[PDB]
Enzyme design. Structure first.
Site, PDB file in Angstrom:
ATOM      1  N   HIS B  41      36.459  18.799   3.306  1.00  0.00           N
ATOM      2  CA  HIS B  41      37.578  19.692   3.010  1.00  0.00           C
ATOM      3  C   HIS B  41      37.772  20.785   4.066  1.00  0.00           C
ATOM      4  CE1 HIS B  41      35.251  23.200   1.825  1.00  0.00           C
ATOM      5  NE2 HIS B  41      34.604  22.529   0.888  1.00  0.00           N
ATOM      6  N   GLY B 140      32.539  30.965   2.344  1.00  0.00           N
ATOM      7  CA  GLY B 140      31.961  30.842   3.663  1.00  0.00           C
ATOM      8  C   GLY B 140      30.645  30.098   3.721  1.00  0.00           C
ATOM      9  N   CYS B 142      30.081  27.067   2.237  1.00  0.00           N
ATOM     10  CA  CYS B 142      30.280  25.622   2.241  1.00  0.00           C
ATOM     11  C   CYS B 142      29.645  25.017   3.479  1.00  0.00           C
ATOM     12  CB  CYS B 142      31.773  25.282   2.203  1.00  0.00           C
ATOM     13  SG  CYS B 142      32.614  25.725   0.656  1.00  0.00           S
TER      14      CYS B 142
END
Ligand SMILES: O=c1[nH]cc(-c2cc(-c3cc(Cl)cc(OCc4cccc(F)c4)c3)c(=O)n(-c3cccnc3)c2)c(=O)[nH]1
Lengths: 300, 290
Positions: B41, B140, B142
């Site tokens: 993503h 932040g 991820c």
């Protein structure tokens, strides 16, 4: 969201842990530049009750000390004693050396522990210095010379070297300058530790962390002077709260809009009522191993 | 002596963390050899994140990879399940011996949370039986990874936060743990349960630490009954873990005790509620010094 007792990334300490042997005695050392730091009772044998450390050191040469950084044997070219820490000059400077400092910390401060065995790290975990100057670590035999520390940007603040387990199962040690925390001595005689008390300003920082993460079930509509909170908190063996504490809780009050003294009232009621079946940040007790600074770093 | 929730040293993994930027999306990637692994993503815009078609959304140049203050040249990109793979010019010299595994629920592991490619901290988790983890993550993070050391066995890569504050992710081959998908929509965890075999293993860590036992041995069938009432995963015969009672002498007695703790209800190793994030291998591992 989320809230866990997280340590700093140990990478920069892992690169400093070496192994120190002196005769029959093996334990860990910290290698920063051309010096290896370790507990001085490395020279003891089973000298445990009334060691004369100066007498014992006088009978050592440089080559009495096996320093071992993985596969390499370091070469000891010098040594001295500074308080309860031994300092070994090696001829090669550790290239893995971080930017670092030594710092003495007051009780209530938190730090990471890298528990090592034979110069090999085994695990990392977060710890608070208790008001009685001890730490409830996880240490086995072989643990000595493990270290506590904070990372701040890329600078490592070293603040603990582990020296002993007390008869009660708690642990004691020194700053990196070799001076113990609390009233302890590196010898096997009876030495009791003062009573342990909850670190009040950390419980308060924890309550704020719970509110930052969306939970207000514990609040109430009361407030309190600072003295009436202390008169009550003491009866649960809570450390006093000082104006200093209340100030550093400043920024957390701001983000929540709950005034420190109001939140002391909440704490007051929690000690009186208990949890009543509920949990806070996953726990069913009031949690005192997080400082206001930890809460600010992890929550926002 | 003593028992703490302990994480594996993280240095081997700190050297593999890097930042990955696509559009205004920034997050963390995993640098191994000449490949950088991160969440797919990272190609989406917020408008895209609503109903994304990844294949279609997916050139090289549009991938800023930042190792420290070094830029990795992206020379090739591809997708495997929910993970993005970015081939780079230069292999990571700090690549440790490693391998991708996939862990079962009830297994524990370490998380090195990151922001802009910089390790912020580490902690020990468990894969919840509902296939979520109760971790600690802000925007932040991820692309932070979970892992075990034995050889680093990466098992987890962080993708999303669910509405309830818990987190969901994938293995390093991009397969989600649990019934979740990588798009902003309506997703929530299944009812969760307490990892029974780990509570027993923790009760053992306390006992061999000087801490509630019970003389009144029950039987396996009788216990699961008690356990199902209280949302505990059933105890299997495999969960019978011999090396911990053989090291402190009684297995169905520990069940006998836990069976009683649930009904009646002080503290053990400094927790008021029963802890289920230590595996039996953890218990030995900690009280052994490996
Ligand atoms: O070659 C090695 N040699 C020795 C050790 C060692 C040594 C001590 C130690 C050191 C001193 Cl100076 C005094 C000491 O009496 C503590 C005591 C006992 C009874 C009453 C009392 F008031 C105090 C023990 C020690 O604690 N530990 C230890 C054990 C468990 C957890 N962490 C630390 C380990 C080692 O690892 N390696």
């Amino acid at each position: 969201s989320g809230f866990r007792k997280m340590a700093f990334p140990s990478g920069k300490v892992e690169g400093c842990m070496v192994q120190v042997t002196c005769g029959t005695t093996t334990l860990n050392g910290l290698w920063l530049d051309d010096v290896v730091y370790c507990p001085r009772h490395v020279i003891c044998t089973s000298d445990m009750l009334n060691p004369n450390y100066e007498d014992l050191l006088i009978r050592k040469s440089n080559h009495n000390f096996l320093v071992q950084a993985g596969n390499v044997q370091l070469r000891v070219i010098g040594h001295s004693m500074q308080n309860c820490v031994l300092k070994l000059k090696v001829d090669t400077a550790n290239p893995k050396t971080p930017k670092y400092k030594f710092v003495r910390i007051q009780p209530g401060q938190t730090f990471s522990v890298l528990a090592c065995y034979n110069g090999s790290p085994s695990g990392v975990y977060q710890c608070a210095m208790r008001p009685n100057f001890t730490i409830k670590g996880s240490f086995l035999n072989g643990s000595c010379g493990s270290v506590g520390f904070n990372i701040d940007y890329d600078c490592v603040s070293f603040c603990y070297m582990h020296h002993m387990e007390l008869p009660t199962g708690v642990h004691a040690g020194t700053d990196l300058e070799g001076n113990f925390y609390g009233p302890f001595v590196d010898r096997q005689t009876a030495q009791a530790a003062g009573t342990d008390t909850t670190i009040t300003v950390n419980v308060l920082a924890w309550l704020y962390a719970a509110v930052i993460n969306g939970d207000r079930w514990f609040l109430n509509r009361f407030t309190t002077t600072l003295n009436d909170f202390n008169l009550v908190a003491m009866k649960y063996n809570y450390e006093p709260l000082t104006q200093d504490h209340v100030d550093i809780l400043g920024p957390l009050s701001a983000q929540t809009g709950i005034a420190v003294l109001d939140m002391c009232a909440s704490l007051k009621e929690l000690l009186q009522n208990g949890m009543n079946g509920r949990t806070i940040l996953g726990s069913a007790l009031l949690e005192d191993e997080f400082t206001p600074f930890d809460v600010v770093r992890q929550c926002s």
